[PDB]
Design a protein around this ligand. Structure first.
Ligand SMILES: CCCCCCCCCCCCCC(=O)SCCNC(=O)CCNC(=O)[C@H](O)C(C)(C)COP(=O)(O)OP(=O)(O)OC[C@H]1O[C@@H](n2cnc3c(N)ncnc32)[C@H](O)[C@@H]1OP(=O)(O)O
Ligand SMILES: Cc1nn(C)c(C)c1NS(=O)(=O)c1c(Cl)cc(CCCN2CCN(C)CC2)cc1Cl
Length: 391
């Protein structure tokens, strides 16, 4: 594939477009505590819900700091819209830079996320305006392509992946309306079915440390290179995205490595992050604590023995579940991307209603497989496609 259009630097406007009357553009500075708080206030009450308005994402302030001030970040790519009078933040749209590989052409992109409009301003076509404005700011900085994901179908997705959910506290999930009771089953059977071992099995599993950064970087890059569409990690990005710094307020990222008991080389790693959802108007529960499978890698993949890879992943990911369960998560979420179809059904992940659609701006490439077939069920012959995860 390649770029759709070339942008003329000479022609990029130095001024933003008009906004709806009574509103103005505002660059957010998320190193200001009070500004990070305003973003959090906006997302907490207006960001992504399920269709039934039972749950809303509640990215924490630590999470917002981590996701939005990643290497190369610029405050210019954190775009707010404020009410002119009250100064209230009523919309946002954000970018951070990264590099991605699209069938072996590397591209400098922004990843767009945290598009949000206050409920009272919805269905006024402010979205195109937000998009066009962040687009202008990216073009002024020499960035002309983007990748983004959404839970909704929009023109020309590059891929689509299904959400899967492994219950950790099945009864809590039942009570909030997250997890159904299967037709002929009972709650006891579901509780029994979701039990997990009390201890991990992979020899040499331990938390990731800073000293592991270069090795993990090498291993993740080799492994991600197996996917048509992947994120091309830098060392700083591995540092930022994979290593928790206990000095955030509230841990966001959990990373574990496998140090081979004999060679002491790291041969595997996996990571998962913390994203809670507000439970809406339920007097007995206000929260679902989800862990999401993030990046991982294993040397076993380079053998191209799909059976040995499966085996290894069943072991590593069951350990990920045990760990998430010890860390008090209520559910573990994963998508059908990476080599995830190899283990999802076997580790008792249930199929979700949600889908994650992947999109590129200003770049054309052939559709990429998303780990599912025509029935939207996991498919080991439709992997090797999506090797990027967005937050
Ligand atoms: C070179 C750099 C380029 C950088 C830019 C790259 C592109 C980045 C793209 C942004 C990627 C963001 C990634 C994420 O953050 S995905 C998460 C998005 N956030 C939410 O779902 C939060 C809850 N919902 C809302 O806040 C509002 O409903 C939003 C803001 C989503 C739309 O507000 P509203 O409901 O009031 O609608 P409107 O009247 O203003 O506008 C209607 C138009 O907007 C199109 N639409 C609706 N939803 C989305 C969506 N999720 N991505 C892209 N476009 C979307 C829609 O098809 C229609 O298009 P069209 O009629 O023109 O065909
Ligand atoms: C528990 C829950 N909270 N929220 C807010 C939602 C939608 C749920 N249900 S769910 O099954 O976990 C689910 C469902 Cl139904 C649907 C989706 C698609 C959401 C896509 N978002 C997540 C990533 N972001 C970059 C784009 C917006 C994600 C999830 Cl995580």
């Amino acid at each position: 594939g390649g770029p759709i259009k070339i942008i003329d630097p000479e022609k990029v406007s130095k001024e933003p477009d008009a906004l709806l009357e009574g509103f103005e553009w505002a660059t957010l500075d998320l190193t200001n505590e009070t500004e990070l708080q305003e973003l959090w206030d906006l997302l907490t009450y207006h960001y992504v819900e399920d269709d039934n308005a039972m749950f809303r994402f509640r990215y924490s302030q630590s999470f917002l700091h981590w996701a939005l001030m990643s290497p190369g970040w610029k405050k210019e790519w954190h775009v707010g819209v404020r009410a002119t009078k009250s100064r209230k933040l009523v919309a946002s749209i954000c970018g951070v830079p990264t590099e991605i590989n699209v069938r072996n052409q590397k591209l400098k992109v922004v990843e767009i996320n945290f598009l949000c409009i206050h409920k009272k301003l919805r269905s006024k076509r402010l979205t195109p305006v937000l998009i066009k404005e962040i687009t202008r700011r990216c073009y002024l900085n020499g960035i002309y392509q983007a990748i983004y994901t959404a839970g909704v179908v929009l023109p020309t997705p590059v891929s689509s992946c299904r959400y899967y959910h492994r219950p950790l506290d099945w009864l809590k999930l039942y009570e909030v309306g997250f997890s159904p009771l299967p037709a002929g089953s009972t709650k006891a059977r579901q509780i029994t079915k979701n039990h997990l071992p009390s201890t991990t099995s992979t020899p040499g599993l331990r938390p990731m440390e800073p000293k592991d950064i270069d090795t993990v970087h090498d291993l993740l890059q080799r492994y991600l290179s197996r996917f048509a569409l992947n994120q091309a990690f830098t060392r700083e990005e591995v540092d930022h995205w994979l290593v928790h710094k206990p000095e955030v307020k509230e841990q966001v990222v959990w990373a574990y490595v496998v140090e081979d008991p004999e060679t002491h080389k790291i041969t595997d790693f996996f990571s998962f992050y913390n994203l809670e959802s507000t439970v809406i108007q339920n007097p007995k529960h206000d929260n679902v604590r989800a862990a999401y499978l993030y990046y991982y890698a294993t040397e076993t993949a380079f053998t191209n023995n799909m059976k040995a890879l499966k085996e290894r992943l069943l072991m590593l990911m069951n350990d990920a579940l045990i760990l998430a369960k010890k860390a008090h998560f209520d559910v573990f979420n994963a998508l059908t991307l990476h080599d995830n179809p190899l283990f999802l059904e076997q580790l008792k992940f249930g199929a979700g209603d949600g889908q994650l659609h992947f999109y590129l701006y200003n770049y054309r490439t052939a559709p990429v497989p998303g780990g599912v077939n025509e029935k939207n069920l996991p498919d080991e012959k439709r992997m090797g496609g999506v090797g990027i995860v967005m937050l």
